[PDB]
Amino acid sequence: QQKLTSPDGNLVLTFQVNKEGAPTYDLTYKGKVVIKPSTLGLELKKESKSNLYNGFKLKDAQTTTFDETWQPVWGEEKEIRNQYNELAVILFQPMNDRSIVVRFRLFNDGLGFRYEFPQQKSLNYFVIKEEHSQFAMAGNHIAYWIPGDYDTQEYDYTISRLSEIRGLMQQAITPNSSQTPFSPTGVQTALMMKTDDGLYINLHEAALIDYSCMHLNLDDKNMIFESWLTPDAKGDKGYMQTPCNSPWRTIIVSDDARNILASRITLNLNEPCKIADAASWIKPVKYIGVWWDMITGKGSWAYTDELTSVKLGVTDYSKTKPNGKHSANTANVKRYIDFAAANGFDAVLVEGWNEGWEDWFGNSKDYVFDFLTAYPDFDVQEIHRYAASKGIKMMMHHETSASVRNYERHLDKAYQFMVDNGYNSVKSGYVGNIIPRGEHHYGQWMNNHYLYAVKKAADYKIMVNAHEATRPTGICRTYPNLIGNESARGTEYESFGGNKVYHTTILPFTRLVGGPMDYTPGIFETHCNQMNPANNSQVRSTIARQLALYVTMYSPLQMAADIPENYERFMDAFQFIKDVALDWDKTIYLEAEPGEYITIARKAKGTDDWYIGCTAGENGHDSQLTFDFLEPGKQYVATVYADAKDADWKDNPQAYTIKKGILNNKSKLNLHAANGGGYAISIKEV
Amino acid sequence: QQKLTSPDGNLVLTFQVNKEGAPTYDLTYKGKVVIKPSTLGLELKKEDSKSNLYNGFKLKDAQTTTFDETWQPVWGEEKEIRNQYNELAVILFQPMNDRSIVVRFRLFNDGLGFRYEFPQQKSLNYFVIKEEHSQFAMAGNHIAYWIPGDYDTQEYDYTISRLSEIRGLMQQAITPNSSQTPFSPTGVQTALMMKTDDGLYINLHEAALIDYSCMHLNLDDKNMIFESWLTPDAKGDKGYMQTPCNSPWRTIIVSDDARNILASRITLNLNEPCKIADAASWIKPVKYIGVWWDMITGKGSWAYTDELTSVKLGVTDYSKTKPNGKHSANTANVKRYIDFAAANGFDAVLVEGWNEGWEDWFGNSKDYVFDFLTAYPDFDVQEIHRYAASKGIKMMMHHETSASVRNYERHLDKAYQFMVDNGYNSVKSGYVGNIIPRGEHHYGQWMNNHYLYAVKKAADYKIMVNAHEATRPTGICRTYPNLIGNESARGTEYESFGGNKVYHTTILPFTRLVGGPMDYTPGIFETHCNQMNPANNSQVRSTIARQLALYVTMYSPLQMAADIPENYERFMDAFQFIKDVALDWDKTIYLEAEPGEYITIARKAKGTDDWYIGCTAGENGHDSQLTFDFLEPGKQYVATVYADAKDADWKDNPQAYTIKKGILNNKSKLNLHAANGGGYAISIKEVKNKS
Ligand SMILES: C[C@H]1O[C@H](O[C@H]2[C@H](O)[C@@H](O)[C@@H](O)O[C@@H]2CO)[C@H](O)[C@@H](O)[C@@H]1N[C@H]1C=C(CO)[C@@H](O)[C@H](O)[C@H]1O
Ligand SMILES: C[C@H]1O[C@H](O[C@H]2[C@H](O)[C@@H](O)[C@@H](O)O[C@@H]2CO)[C@H](O)[C@@H](O)[C@@H]1N[C@H]1C=C(CO)[C@@H](O)[C@H](O)[C@H]1O
Ligand SMILES: [Ca+2]
Ligand SMILES: [Ca+2]
Ligand code: NA
Ligand code: NA
């Protein structure tokens, strides 16, 4: 039996090969079982060689320590400490004359482990049939979960016992453009859990590279989660060549929910930055967009309503009749540029700028876009000239309609077109079933594609925000030009019937573990019927809570998603969106309970200014704030953006108060969050 | 109810919708049934009745028109091709699904082409083909010259059998290959060649295979009906379609004279006209040698080093590896090939194994297998370019993909730019192994898109393409004449892997060569492979004279002399035919042809009065009584006959040949005997302009 302890001594891992030769581990935190005895291993595709899960012998083992500090290009703080004790075990399989290494890294806030496959005579090329990584639970915990799916993460969270997942799964799987649920007890990572004995446990992975995306399948009789990888077109779960490594599997654990949010285990298990000049060109982006028009149905992506279908290079759009709904027209874009410039925004996104949108949805169309040819009413050169004159950058849009070979064929030309026309950031998308047909969004094949697009973008000094991509696993450390994904249910679904009131009190515990989200907050007119009378969707938020998301939904990429006209009605509240920073020297998690409330204070990078947000669930929240994180002796202008006493997400969402006063490190504030409400505070040094 | 006749009146097509509403056609030739009543149509993938595009049709309208125009190939068997047909177009309406299709029939003096057309309409836009149900109902139990139906290889020896015997012979006919997916006990590939008991020759094939899955044939051996069997994708579907769109043409070439099957240009005539405006200014035939046979025979390696199990490109440091002393693609060795090419008037030298990755290329389903850009330490790209240019030689680029197709596409613009930057204007590509993306086949719609994408992009760089393991050609060279080659059949390489059947080159022109030329790589003089590699006991099933014959009987604008220079140096008298023979022709005459037995062809070298003749013979040899009526009255010629010696034989005495020079004219007569697996070659050079 091998033993490993955290630097602070509070976590203990034990490892042994069991009587069947199965590698086994367990984990305790302050004397409480976190992971019961759990087996590790893989089954390989047949060409006893299929068995890489038992008949192992422990040949050697070592423990080492590591302690270094590094600086993110952008992040929640200036400096991250990477401190762990490491156990490496060398496991030999006599029957197959081959060895693997299992590497365990134990931090004060949890455990990472991975498989390593050394180059040897009897292990070179192999295909994974299944990974059999176990996470044996000590009880029937509360879980905050979305359905296990190879193609979408755009689901509302369910809060239930592990025993209740099976019964709730059918109702949890709501309609989506591309979805492949795999099990009645299948869930996605990161999975958040709360134990009856007062522990918070997060199960996830780190550095998902050259490998298939991991989901979890629950054995709900023994309460064991098992790794369930995403299959390819032939049902296989990864083409490997030694030397190679699995991604890390992570268990983040604390008796304080705030320490789950504070964990940097995911980033710490990724390889250091591989972009030498990163600081010189990678910058956070605050943006508005020609976007909400089309999401609500007020406007169209399409130029014309005249065409049943289109053939790019044959269809002559100059001979088609404008539908009068096409939001991506030069005059309209210039009005967005004016509003962006007046209010200190960095960029304007425009969607529907390019030929093809008439056919974009659900046709499995190969040649669906060229990412190069503007519609007749979108003047790329004039918009570039005008934006540049107002100190604004345009954000490029590359919806692929999940036609991935087509995107790859155009990708160098599309990136060159961006550079030639003054675009340095792109929002990509993968809406529809993947082409090549038979592949899923999160398979090894597509994971390669998403990273290929990011690596190539880095060579062009382009920042990437990829919607519908595999959810992040901390690769932003290695490639910091990946400034965003959606890869979860965003504000767009507030237009498609609504998100659960508690949604933004769960995402920071689940989706945000591994990288930021382009959540597109800032909807002030929460009734979608004001954009489109046929749309009766209502945003499950107060205005004050929308302001809070600029602090509680961390991202270097922040949209103000509403139309300028709606911001002009509430410019007093809009001041918080104008003021709030995108990048931070320090973050303090003041209050956190998944599904109930999140309160975060952040120090704007290079300043002594602080920003606070609180987001609350179905029953609201009461905060008793203290400000001992402020500098002794310094006075601050505090602006509190709060729910009015009669505010409510459903009955009275636009009821807010704004109060300015002098604050210091001795100040105390008691604040009430409405149901689906919250508050925002700017704290600017005098 | 609808009738169409050939321009000359010898062929009659009838079309009617049968009682089930199934479109039906038949074909007669000089009063003989060629195609019995045969149904047409498709089954579509379910999103009940909408899946049915095979019956419940009504004949809505029809017209007959005539067409007669002549066009000039960039390269070909003749200067001019006549495109003359009568056309029947039928509009077929399906009331139950409120949609129409068009079936278009083109009837020539030498056979029939038909295709489906899917017009843009309210009720037909995006659809997926489950199966095509194009029937070819045979009049009898014909002799067929066939290879196994397969989604991934055509590298099979031919079988000659009755249609009734195909089922019993299929298992024996499927030999081991790097990538193969046979689909049916009675599945065969196209072009399929047949000989009837009532004196007819019938060829079944397709033309203009674009944005569609490759067609094979599946035999109903109880009713003797062949049916279209398309290549499935990774999900088992057989084509993603968007109206307006067309199927490829399906062709029935028929004559009572086997020579008229070879003479048919129906395949080329059914392709769209040339889309490369400046084609003549840069597309040129290529005669080449190669650093190649060394590696095929096992004498040399593609690999730089023997020290590595596997490689990681960009990590593996080849400057730290030991040269294996067998690596043929080294600067000094390549320069010696350039010297031989330059001295003997060849256009190009192919080099394989020039680039990092060959230590770890074969049958691993490896994604990042090659970069098409980084030379081995012993191959100086820049020095070889300078040296080749100084000797008036072009280097032919090699892009083996190891069937890793996304990887090739990601590199393709950079790889073509690298070619242009370093003076390469032609590329031999390859797709050895199971396709990546995994689940796709070599001949599916997905890969057909890839191969044509590679050709279209090459055209923009003024690059000519020779693609091994690609879908077999269907006349697209008319549209994109920079496609100067495919293998896409069993080539000379298999003469190193145990041998080709003696009769192989008497069948390929009736089958594989219908739709475009083959890079067959003829010209092996040292037919015992154990002289290259003692461990290799394979023998080429040929005499030397028959190897010379293939430069005329295996038509291609791309011709390799495949042997090593030192082997040619031992038989330079015979090598003179390979030096002299043209690559491009103003006229071709098929003098003698019987599939599986013998082919004799005369060709007039483009822009000249010079003629070249080849005869290739099967297991029993052949006797020719040649006449020369095709020569110009009054003109005298120097004829050089390269023939089998009296005691020549492919197995027992393959290197026994004679060379006889004499004066020839249009009244000359020559009686020649081809040995078993033998043949002959004749250069006929007009006396005044002789060189
Ligand atoms: C625009 C949106 O379309 C799809 O959303 C559908 C929902 O999945 C369904 O539940 C149902 O309500 O209909 C919705 C509309 O068809 C798709 O699934 C989403 O992922 C998609 N969102 C992306 C598409 C865009 C266009 O390029 C972007 O504007 C947007 O920001 C993307 O996130
Ligand atoms: C080189 C050759 O390899 C494969 O051939 C195998 C045969 O299929 C088997 O029957 C058995 O005998 O082993 C042979 C060697 O492994 C493959 O199937 C062929 O298609 C392949 N030929 C191409 C490969 C090349 C390398 O790029 C070229 O040199 C050659 O011209 C290609 O045609
Ligand atoms: Ca989306
Ligand atoms: Ca081959
Ligand atoms: Na309240
Ligand atoms: Na004889």
Short mmCIF file of N, CA and C and ligand atoms in Angstrom, two decimals, chain A residues 154 175-178 291 295 301 351 357 360-361 397 399 427 431 467-468 486 492-493 496, ligand 1:
data_model
loop_
_atom_site.label_atom_id
_atom_site.label_comp_id
_atom_site.label_asym_id
_atom_site.label_seq_id
_atom_site.Cartn_x
_atom_site.Cartn_y
_atom_site.Cartn_z
N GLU A 154 -26.36 22.27 -23.55
CA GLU A 154 -27.28 23.44 -23.46
C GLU A 154 -28.54 23.06 -22.66
N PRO A 175 -35.52 19.43 -25.77
CA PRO A 175 -35.16 19.44 -27.20
C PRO A 175 -33.99 20.36 -27.55
N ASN A 176 -33.07 19.88 -28.40
CA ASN A 176 -31.89 20.65 -28.87
C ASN A 176 -31.61 20.30 -30.33
N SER A 177 -30.97 21.22 -31.06
CA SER A 177 -30.59 21.10 -32.50
C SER A 177 -29.75 19.84 -32.75
N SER A 178 -28.85 19.49 -31.83
CA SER A 178 -27.96 18.30 -31.94
C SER A 178 -27.72 17.72 -30.55
N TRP A 291 -27.15 40.86 -32.81
CA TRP A 291 -27.21 39.49 -32.25
C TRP A 291 -28.60 39.20 -31.68
N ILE A 295 -31.72 36.34 -32.28
CA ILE A 295 -32.03 35.33 -31.23
C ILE A 295 -33.51 35.42 -30.83
N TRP A 301 -30.82 36.55 -39.73
CA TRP A 301 -29.44 36.35 -40.24
C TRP A 301 -29.47 36.44 -41.78
N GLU A 351 -23.50 39.25 -36.67
CA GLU A 351 -23.89 37.94 -37.24
C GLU A 351 -24.85 38.17 -38.42
N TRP A 357 -26.84 32.19 -45.03
CA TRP A 357 -27.70 32.07 -43.83
C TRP A 357 -29.10 31.55 -44.18
N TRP A 360 -28.80 27.70 -43.30
CA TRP A 360 -27.77 27.40 -42.27
C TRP A 360 -28.22 26.25 -41.35
N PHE A 361 -29.52 25.99 -41.20
CA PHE A 361 -30.04 25.24 -40.03
C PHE A 361 -30.61 23.86 -40.39
N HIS A 397 -17.65 36.73 -37.12
CA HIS A 397 -18.56 35.60 -36.82
C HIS A 397 -18.33 34.48 -37.83
N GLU A 399 -20.06 31.07 -37.75
CA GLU A 399 -20.98 29.90 -37.64
C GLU A 399 -20.59 28.92 -38.75
N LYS A 427 -15.93 34.86 -33.06
CA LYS A 427 -16.94 33.96 -32.46
C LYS A 427 -17.23 32.87 -33.48
N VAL A 431 -23.41 24.59 -34.89
CA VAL A 431 -24.85 24.26 -34.74
C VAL A 431 -25.25 23.20 -35.79
N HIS A 467 -18.52 28.71 -29.69
CA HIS A 467 -19.84 28.17 -29.26
C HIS A 467 -19.96 26.71 -29.74
N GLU A 468 -20.65 25.88 -28.95
CA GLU A 468 -20.98 24.45 -29.18
C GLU A 468 -19.73 23.55 -29.17
N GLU A 486 -19.03 28.97 -25.27
CA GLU A 486 -20.36 28.86 -24.62
C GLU A 486 -20.36 27.51 -23.90
N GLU A 492 -28.96 33.07 -24.38
CA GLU A 492 -29.81 32.83 -25.58
C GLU A 492 -31.05 32.01 -25.19
N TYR A 493 -30.95 31.07 -24.25
CA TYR A 493 -32.10 30.20 -23.87
C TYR A 493 -33.14 30.98 -23.05
N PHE A 496 -35.62 31.37 -25.52
CA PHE A 496 -36.17 30.07 -25.99
C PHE A 496 -37.02 29.41 -24.90
C1 LIG C 1 -29.47 30.03 -32.35
C2 LIG C 1 -29.45 28.73 -31.57
O1 LIG C 1 -30.18 27.76 -32.33
C3 LIG C 1 -30.41 26.52 -31.66
O2 LIG C 1 -31.26 26.70 -30.51
C4 LIG C 1 -32.50 25.95 -30.56
C5 LIG C 1 -32.70 25.21 -29.25
O3 LIG C 1 -31.68 24.22 -29.11
C6 LIG C 1 -34.05 24.52 -29.17
O4 LIG C 1 -34.28 24.16 -27.80
C7 LIG C 1 -35.24 25.33 -29.74
O5 LIG C 1 -35.82 26.19 -28.78
O6 LIG C 1 -34.88 26.12 -30.87
C8 LIG C 1 -33.68 26.89 -30.76
C9 LIG C 1 -33.55 27.69 -32.04
O7 LIG C 1 -33.55 26.78 -33.14
C10 LIG C 1 -29.09 25.89 -31.22
O8 LIG C 1 -29.33 24.69 -30.48
C11 LIG C 1 -28.27 26.89 -30.40
O9 LIG C 1 -27.04 26.32 -29.99
C12 LIG C 1 -28.07 28.14 -31.27
N1 LIG C 1 -27.13 29.14 -30.73
C13 LIG C 1 -25.88 29.47 -31.47
C14 LIG C 1 -26.18 30.00 -32.86
C15 LIG C 1 -25.85 31.22 -33.28
C16 LIG C 1 -25.85 31.59 -34.74
O10 LIG C 1 -24.55 31.51 -35.30
C17 LIG C 1 -25.41 32.31 -32.33
O11 LIG C 1 -26.14 33.52 -32.55
C18 LIG C 1 -25.57 31.88 -30.88
O12 LIG C 1 -24.91 32.81 -30.01
C19 LIG C 1 -25.01 30.48 -30.71
O13 LIG C 1 -24.94 30.13 -29.32
#
